[PDB]
Amino acid sequence: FSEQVATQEVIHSENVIKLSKDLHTTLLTFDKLDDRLTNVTQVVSPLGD
Amino acid sequence: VNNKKISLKISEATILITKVVRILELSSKCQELITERKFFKVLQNLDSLEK
User: Fold this and answer.
1) CA–CA separation, A25 vs A7, rounded Å?
2) What is the DSSP letter of B42?
3) How far apart (Å, rounded) are the C-alpha atoms in residues A40 and B26?
4) Which family does the record claim for this protein (chain B)?
């Protein structure tokens, strides 16, 4: 009964909810990733230069 | 643990069923062996059980 459905509630609801929130924050992290990569290779033009 | 719950009631149910089956057969053999000084439904019900 609602112990198992409580695992559906907390696990499914919190898993979906913090899955979207943590994965969207991870998308902001990937925004910082390509940010630092773009500034990185853009600073690495003097390497080939 | 909801699948250990459902698994526990699942295999508990199936083993309860097979336990009921062997309980029935050994119960019938007890009904056979109980009959002393009758010798008439002995071969009838006993040979029905061994079938």
Assistant:
1) 25
2) H
3) 81
4) Belongs to the SEC15 family.
